[PDB]
Amino acid sequence: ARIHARKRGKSGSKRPPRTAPPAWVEYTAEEVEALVVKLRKEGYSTAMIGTILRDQYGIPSVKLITGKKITKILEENGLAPEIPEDLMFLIRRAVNLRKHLEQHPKDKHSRRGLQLIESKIRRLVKYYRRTGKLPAKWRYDPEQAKLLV
């Protein structure tokens, strides 16, 4: 996490260089997609869908087994989010923190956290505008985020 604090942590994943899927996998592509859809309807996020598929069903790399991604599957169907998940998570955090600071005016160390969150939001907004997943004039407004969430 280097964006603001400038600490050089390294705690990620080690994916092996695979060209093809393994044989010990019990499921097929159609069953995998059906599982994705069921776990979406239970109200899970993409990242948790994948974590559950890896921990409880033995599926590594939905994209290995199928040839698609989880969000592509959900868009092939009608279950994709209107705005992206990462942005939504950040907006929810900001809304909660703002209601906290309305009751705690002199905290003064969590307000900088709010500012950092909103700078992140703006970075992502600028990216998604260019790429087309948001309109070219979308703006972050807290008063309307209150309803977005």
Partner 1 sequence: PKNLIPMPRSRFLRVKCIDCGNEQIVFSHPATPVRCLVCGATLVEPTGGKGIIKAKVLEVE
Partner 2 sequence: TLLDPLANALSHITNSERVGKKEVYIKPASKLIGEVLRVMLENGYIGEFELIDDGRAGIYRVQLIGKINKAGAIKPRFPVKARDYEKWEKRFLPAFEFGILIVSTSQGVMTHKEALEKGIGGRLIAYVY
Nearest to 71 by CA among 54, 47, 53, 51: 47
Who's near 9: CB < 8 A, 6+ residues apart? 1
Question: In angstroms, what is the minimal distance from the CB of 12 to RNA?
Answer: 5
Q: Which residue has the tokens 């900088």?
A: 112
Instruction: Decide if residue 18 touches partner 2 (CB under 8 A).
Output: yes
Encoded amino acid at 53, one letter: L
Q: Least separation, in Å, of the C-beta of 49 and partner 1?
A: 11
Interacting residues toward partner 1 by CB under 8 A: 13-17, 22, 24, 26, 48, 51-52, 54-58, 60
What is the DSSP-derived secondary structure letter of residue 18?
Answer: -
Which CB atom, from 6 or from 41, has the smaller least distance to RNA? 6
CA atoms of 69 and 63, how far apart (whole Å): 5
CB nearer to RNA: give 69 or 145: 69
Report the distance separating Cα 125 and Cα 148, nearest Å. 15
Q: Are 59 and 65 in contact (CB under 8 A)?
A: yes
Which of RNA, partner 2, partner 1, none does 58 bind, CB closer than 5 to 8 A by kind?
Answer: partner 1
Residues within the interface to RNA (CB under 7 A): 1-16, 18, 22, 45-51, 54, 60-63, 69-72, 84-86, 89-90, 93, 96-97, 100, 104-113, 115-117, 119-120, 122-124, 126-127, 131
Check if the beta carbon of residue 2 is closer than 8 Å to that of residue 120.
no
Task: Examine residue 16 and tell whether it contacts partner 2 (CB under 8 A).
Answer: yes
- Binding region for partner 2 (CB under 8 A): 15-18
